[PDB]
Design an enzyme around this catalytic site. Structure first.
Site, mmCIF file in Angstrom:
data_model
loop_
_atom_site.group_PDB
_atom_site.id
_atom_site.type_symbol
_atom_site.label_atom_id
_atom_site.label_comp_id
_atom_site.label_asym_id
_atom_site.label_seq_id
_atom_site.Cartn_x
_atom_site.Cartn_y
_atom_site.Cartn_z
ATOM 1 N N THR A 40 -62.750 76.808 34.599
ATOM 2 C CA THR A 40 -62.019 75.970 33.661
ATOM 3 C C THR A 40 -61.573 76.874 32.516
ATOM 4 O O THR A 40 -60.934 76.297 31.641
ATOM 5 C CB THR A 40 -62.782 74.727 33.073
ATOM 6 N N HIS A 45 -69.527 80.024 29.283
ATOM 7 C CA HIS A 45 -69.877 79.969 27.847
ATOM 8 C C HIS A 45 -71.331 79.550 27.790
ATOM 9 O O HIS A 45 -71.953 79.281 28.848
ATOM 10 C CB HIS A 45 -68.882 79.156 27.009
ATOM 11 N N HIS A 48 -73.136 76.768 29.919
ATOM 12 C CA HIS A 48 -73.564 77.081 31.263
ATOM 13 C C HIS A 48 -74.908 77.797 31.332
ATOM 14 O O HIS A 48 -75.419 77.875 32.479
ATOM 15 C CB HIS A 48 -72.529 77.990 31.958
ATOM 16 N N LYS A 82 -66.215 64.311 30.525
ATOM 17 C CA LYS A 82 -64.879 64.440 29.955
ATOM 18 C C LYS A 82 -64.411 63.016 29.675
ATOM 19 O O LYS A 82 -64.506 62.141 30.543
ATOM 20 C CB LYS A 82 -63.994 65.254 30.908
ATOM 21 N N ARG A 86 -57.721 65.725 32.551
ATOM 22 C CA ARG A 86 -57.398 67.121 32.229
ATOM 23 C C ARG A 86 -56.119 67.495 32.974
ATOM 24 O O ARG A 86 -55.726 66.804 33.927
ATOM 25 C CB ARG A 86 -58.519 68.075 32.643
ATOM 26 N N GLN A 173 -67.431 67.714 45.853
ATOM 27 C CA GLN A 173 -68.755 68.187 45.455
ATOM 28 C C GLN A 173 -69.736 67.657 46.520
ATOM 29 O O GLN A 173 -70.658 68.327 47.026
ATOM 30 C CB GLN A 173 -69.189 67.805 44.048
ATOM 31 N N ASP A 194 -74.591 65.585 33.279
ATOM 32 C CA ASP A 194 -73.382 64.884 33.689
ATOM 33 C C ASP A 194 -73.085 64.934 35.185
ATOM 34 O O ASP A 194 -72.150 64.188 35.541
ATOM 35 C CB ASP A 194 -72.170 65.333 32.890
ATOM 36 N N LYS A 228 -72.866 68.741 18.133
ATOM 37 C CA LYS A 228 -72.663 69.250 19.496
ATOM 38 C C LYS A 228 -73.122 70.692 19.680
ATOM 39 O O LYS A 228 -72.551 71.600 19.049
ATOM 40 C CB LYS A 228 -71.176 69.053 19.749
ATOM 41 N N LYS A 231 -71.031 73.986 19.374
ATOM 42 C CA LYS A 231 -69.822 73.667 18.607
ATOM 43 C C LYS A 231 -69.916 74.394 17.266
ATOM 44 O O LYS A 231 -70.492 73.883 16.302
ATOM 45 C CB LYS A 231 -69.606 72.179 18.464
ATOM 46 N N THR A 232 -69.337 75.569 17.261
ATOM 47 C CA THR A 232 -69.254 76.483 16.119
ATOM 48 C C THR A 232 -67.930 76.334 15.393
ATOM 49 O O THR A 232 -66.958 75.744 15.899
ATOM 50 C CB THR A 232 -69.486 77.940 16.682
#
EC number: 6.1.1.1
Lengths: 317, 317
Positions: A40, A45, A48, A82, A86, A173, A194, A228, A231-232
């Site tokens: 994606t 990041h 994961h 999500k 997308r 999946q 999720d 989050k 979430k920086t």
């Protein structure tokens, strides 16, 4: 048994299809397990890291991990977690990103072990060449629309809206689990929080085609402040040192709030219970020292970028 | 204009996407139209005659008909007008049945005309070789699950149940319209009553991919007694003379109830309005003569089996 009890202590078990059945099997055999990651972006990041490191923990306990690169599915896109539909990425984009992702995945696993060496796989290999007719009959006959609508990922989106494209993702999946179960003896699938629906879908497909296998999900990583995780202000904390330097990676962890540090040590590190506990007591008695925070920072930066990289981060700080 | 007004008089128009737009186009150009038939048996039956003969009527008015054999879709199965999920037939079965069906279709259309000769096509040719990924992205991105659930064929079945296989059928028929629109200039699709949803789906796909085309459905054939047209004690009235002899075919029509005869003359025959009206008056004045009934019987048996076949039926009676 003890691996599962350890994950539990760490807080790495959100849900499990059947805990006693899985504990039993883990304890009696070398279990082949898998985790899927869809390209994606051109880098994984920190979102994961839990699933990744959890694979690793399974490998250290003597089980065999399969890292699945979502070459096919990254071309459809998972609605799971999500809130919005997308945009479809191009084959070329996805194809390029899969190659990189493959490289970062490999860092965390052991290829040298005999008995339980990892495998990195790409679902493009079996989904790529599958014809729609085969797909609709061999996979689709097994699922009622009613079963699929009830899924958190879909339920969560029907008013918001969801194309047939993303609604069908689960089938793919689903299919991955079956194929891995068949060609690799895969008996366990793990994923983030999720993925429950997608996992159980794979289980429904196996059950209906064979009539044995388990699913385990890791919980969403929380912050005491209710924000989050990851979430920086800077944006995403990537695993690619060219996107997020080891210095920045390092800083990110060093800035863990006292409230989260102990949950993150358990999640992201290979420190024992007794080491983690000791740090908890050090956190209580001397919180301006920031010992829990440096240990996390060093441990995680070494994992991801290595010692030399850690060394620089430290001297740059 | 007059073709459409004639179909209306006959009662062959259930619904139409846009009557004035279609009348206009029919009146200004040679329209390429299509109708699809799925091999669900080794022979067509009287349930297919309205749409078939309606094609023919379009051909006689100077338009070009395309008869589509459901080689691909007969492998999925349409829930439309079915209260229950159907069993999947094998490729070999369907493949064999498509060959026969192709043969009976060809009887009703003109291949010699220059300007508007028919085409018989098989959707296996473009669906057969389509990969699932292509299908999900190129067709599926265009449809929300919400649009599809609202369809009569699906709405009608969610409690009853429907697999993803049959739920997706509509996408395939959708796709057929698009491909025919593109490769053959097809601007109109016709079908029985139950195909509205599938047709409009094809229209939604065209609109969303191109941003022009119409749909027309024929009404369910009714009986004054409220029973099911073609539901005989004998079982189905097939178009294959080896399943239903011309004698039996003939008898079936000869036994039309006085209450239905005039609706069937309009539906199934090429008798003019003035001929049909005259028979109505003869039906009023001398109903034991059974003139409407013999005319129907002869007209329809000739259509389907030919004169010699008719001759035998008559002498056998």
């Amino acid at each position: 048994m003890d691996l599962l009890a350890e994950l539990q202590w760490r807080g790495l078990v959100n849900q499990t299809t059947d805990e006693d059945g899985l504990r039993k099997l883990l304890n009696e055999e070398r279990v082949t397990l898998y985790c899927g990651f869809d390209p994606t972006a051109d880098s994984l990041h920190i979102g994961h890291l839990a699933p990744i490191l959890t694979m690793r923990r399974f490998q250290q306990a003597g089980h065999r991990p399969i890292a699945l690169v979502g070459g096919a599915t990254g071309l459809i896109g998972d609605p799971s977690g999500k809130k919005s539909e997308r945009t479809l990425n191009a084959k070329e984009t996805v194809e390029a990103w899969s190659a990189r992702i493959k490289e970062q995945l490999g860092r965390f696993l052991d290829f040298e072990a005999d008995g339980n060496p990892a495998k990195i796989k790409n679902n493009y290999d079996w989904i790529g060449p599958l014809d729609v007719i085969t797909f609709l009959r061999d996979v689709g006959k097994h699922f009622s629309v009613n079963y699929m609508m009830a899924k958190e990922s879909v339920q969560s989106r029907i008013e918001t809206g969801i194309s047939f494209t993303e609604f069908s993702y689960m089938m793919l999946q689903a299919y991955d689990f079956l194929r891995l179960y068949e060609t690799e003896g895969c008996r366990l699938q793990i994923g983030g929080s999720d993925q429950w629906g997608n996992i159980t879908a794979g289980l429904e497909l196996i059950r209906k085609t064979k009539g044995r296998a388990f699913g385990l999900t890791i919980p969403l990583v929380t912050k005491a402040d209710g924000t989050k995780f990851g979430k920086t202000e800077s944006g995403t904390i990537w695993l690619d040192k060219e996107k997020t330097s080891p210095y920045e990676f390092y800083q990110f962890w060093i800035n863990t709030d006292d409230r989260d540090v102990i949950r993150y040590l358990k999640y992201f590190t290979f420190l024992s219970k007794e080491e983690i506990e000791a740090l908890e007591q050090e956190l209580r008695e001397a919180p301006e020292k920031r010992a829990a925070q440096k240990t996390l920072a060093e441990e995680v930066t070494k994992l991801v970028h290595g010692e030399e990289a850690l060394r620089q981060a430290i001297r740059i700080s």
